[PDB]
């Protein structure tokens, strides 16, 4: 009585794979710090050039994305996290993503910090959390995050 | 199943022939760089003087051109291309005029540059292009222009 | 043949070499040549230099940050800085508009496809659409 | 609004050249970074800026004629200009004799 | 004879359009006019 685990959108760190995907023409999504989230693409055909679109949704029959030529910078790619547009989605904006260290209350009334190794969902759309060293899956309300 | 070749409006370079045509009274059309395209004419009758009109179309029964006296300059004629108004027309504003060097893809996947020697048109108004060294006539989409 | 040029085709190879830290030479149009480099240390970002000559005790290159555009890299020609040759002493550069005459005494235009030389220094040129070689005199440099 | 009323302009930031003499505190007459001026410059950044009141004020003196005048400019948001920054407008040409 | 129908579009796409700069030249030109109303003072009434 549940739904299988949902993969998180893996950020891409290596520039080489980013450029290879771009050369293949696969769409990229760039999280700019100052001015929001944008799509990046390589122009099809012989006249190769980079294009940008702010039509920030999955392509649909009723919603076709418009692409403007832009001189995307290498430094922009390096300093800003980039995701494959096939993955990054509204489907699961989980409060505690995978590999995040979170604080959870154990049965012995002793707060411990563990890293989330697996996350899944159920019929109600809840976020079941798996923590290393324990089998029982916790809930959203029980957990807590520690920052800095 | 086509239409015969269409002549391009030959620019006139020699000032002497320009002046001779003007003395004969044949209309001239001057492409001014700064302020568009104008007509130039010699006044009929004894009171000879140059006249200008911006009634920039072929004369018609329903559209009669109005001529204003103007002191046309020799330097204007020399530095600006001039055409006979009997020739220069909207009929064919071809993207790649005659004697223009254009880049065309050959069957061996090797791009070559050739000069357009002959241009014609067909029923649909297409622009068939003849290139030196080849018999088959290319189309607008296949070709490409290289500037500077 | 001549070993004076070894242009890079894929941008992926360019990025791979940049990761290795090797300097690149990037040509321009009616403009000075450029050298490009990846900064060392914790923070990675592109750097450029307007200087071209080799580093020495009497000459040191200057590097500054710049938001280099991938369009320049993909479009313009790129070489390894260390292995670049300054000039090949030929009348006509590669990829230059030229005029010639065909086998049937017909005049035609073309661009240079290859630049070659013999052991005695005599230079032969091959044009696009012409497999045979042409003398330096037989060619004509077309005016822009 | 700013992008509409402005003019395209190259913004290059200013910074003191290392070539300054450590003892006198005044610059070398000629070096690649700065041509005698004691202040060097960074690579340019393409920018749109509004400009007003442009004046070519001429002072005639014993040393000779001299061109100096005030021009008032207004930038975009998030841009923090600094003292003795430099701008150049390729579009606009100025006659001199 | 045949009915007149709109048909398809023909305008191609253009990218990176550069501005037009008026070219400096010593040659003469002609200043393209506009013929319209003119405003003037009533100099007679000014005398009054």
């Amino acid at each position: 009585i549940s739904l299988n685990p949902i993969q998180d959108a893996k950020p891409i760190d290596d520039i080489v794979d980013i450029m290879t995907y771009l050369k293949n023409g696969k769409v990229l999504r760039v999280k700019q710090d100052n001015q929001g989230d944008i799509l990046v693409r390589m122009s099809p055909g012989k006249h190769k050039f980079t294009e940008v679109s702010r039509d920030l949704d999955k392509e649909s029959f009723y919603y076709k994305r418009h692409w403007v030529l832009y001189n995307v910078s290498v430094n922009s790619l390096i300093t800003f996290d980039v995701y494959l547009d096939e993955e990054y989605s509204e489907t699961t904006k989980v409060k505690y993503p995978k590999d995040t260290i979170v604080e959870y209350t154990r049965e012995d009334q002793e707060k411990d910090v563990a890293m989330i190794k697996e996350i899944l969902t159920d019929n109600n759309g809840n976020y079941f959390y798996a923590l290393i060293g324990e089998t029982m899956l916790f809930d959203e309300n029980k957990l807590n995050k520690v920052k800095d | 199943i086509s239409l015969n070749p269409i002549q391009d409006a030959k620019p006139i370079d020699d000032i002497v022939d320009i002046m001779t045509y003007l003395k004969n009274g044949k209309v001239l059309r001057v492409k001014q760089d700064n302020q568009g395209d104008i007509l130039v004419r010699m006044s009929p009758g004894k009171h000879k003087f140059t006249e200008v009109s911006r009634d920039l179309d072929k004369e018609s029964f329903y559209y009669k051109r109005h001529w204003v006296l103007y002191n046309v300059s020799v330097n204007s004629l020399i530095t600006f291309d001039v055409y006979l108004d009997e020739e220069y027309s909207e009929t064919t504003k071809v993207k790649y005029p005659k004697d223009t060097i254009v880049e065309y893809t050959r069957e061996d996947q090797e791009k070559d540059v050739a000069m357009i020697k002959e241009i014609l048109t067909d029923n649909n108004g297409n622009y068939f292009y003849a290139l030196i060294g080849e018999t088959m006539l290319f189309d607008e989409n296949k070709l490409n222009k290289v500037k500077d | 043949p001549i070993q004076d040029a070894k242009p890079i085709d894929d941008i992926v190879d360019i990025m791979t070499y940049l990761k290795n830290g090797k300097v690149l030479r990037v040509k321009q149009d009616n403009q000075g040549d450029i050298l490009v480099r990846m900064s060392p240390g914790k923070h990675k970002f592109t750097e450029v230099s307007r200087d071209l000559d080799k580093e020495s005790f009497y000459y040191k290159r200057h590097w500054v940050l710049y938001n280099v555009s991938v369009n320049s890299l993909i479009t313009f020609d790129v070489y390894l800085d260390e292995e670049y040759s300054e000039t090949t002493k030929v009348k006509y550069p590669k990829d230059t508009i030229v005029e010639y005459t065909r086998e049937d005494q017909e005049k035609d235009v073309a661009m240079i496809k290859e630049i070659l030389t013999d052991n005695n220094g005599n230079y032969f040129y091959a044009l696009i659409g012409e497999t045979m070689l042409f003398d330096e005199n037989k060619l004509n440099k077309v005016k822009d | 609004f700013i992008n509409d009323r402005g003019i395209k302009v190259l913004w290059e930031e200013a910074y003191f050249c290392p070539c300054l003499n450590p003892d006198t505190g005044h610059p070398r007459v000629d070096c690649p970074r700065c041509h005698g001026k004691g202040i060097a410059y960074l690579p340019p950044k393409e920018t749109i800026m509004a400009i007003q009141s442009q004046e070519k004020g001429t002072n005639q003196l014993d040393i000779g004629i001299l061109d100096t005048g005030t021009a008032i400019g207004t930038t975009q948001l998030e841009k923090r200009i600094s003292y003795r920054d430099r701008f150049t407008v390729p579009e606009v040409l100025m006659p001199q004799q | 004879e045949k009915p007149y129908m709109i048909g398809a579009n023909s305008n191609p796409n253009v990218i990176n359009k550069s501005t037009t700069y008026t070219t400096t030249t010593q040659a003469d030109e002609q200043d393209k006019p506009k013929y319209t109303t003119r405003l003037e003072f009533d100099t007679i009434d000014m005398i009054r």
């Binding site: - | 989409n141 | 369009n71 | 410059y41 690579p43 393409e46 070519k56 021009a71 | -």
Partner: peptide, 25 residues
Amino acid sequence: KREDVIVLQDPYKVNDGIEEDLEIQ
């Protein structure tokens, strides 16, 4: 303020290989 007393050349901007007024199809 205008630059009269000391004049420096226009800055060396990095060019882009994108042709201006480029046809697309």
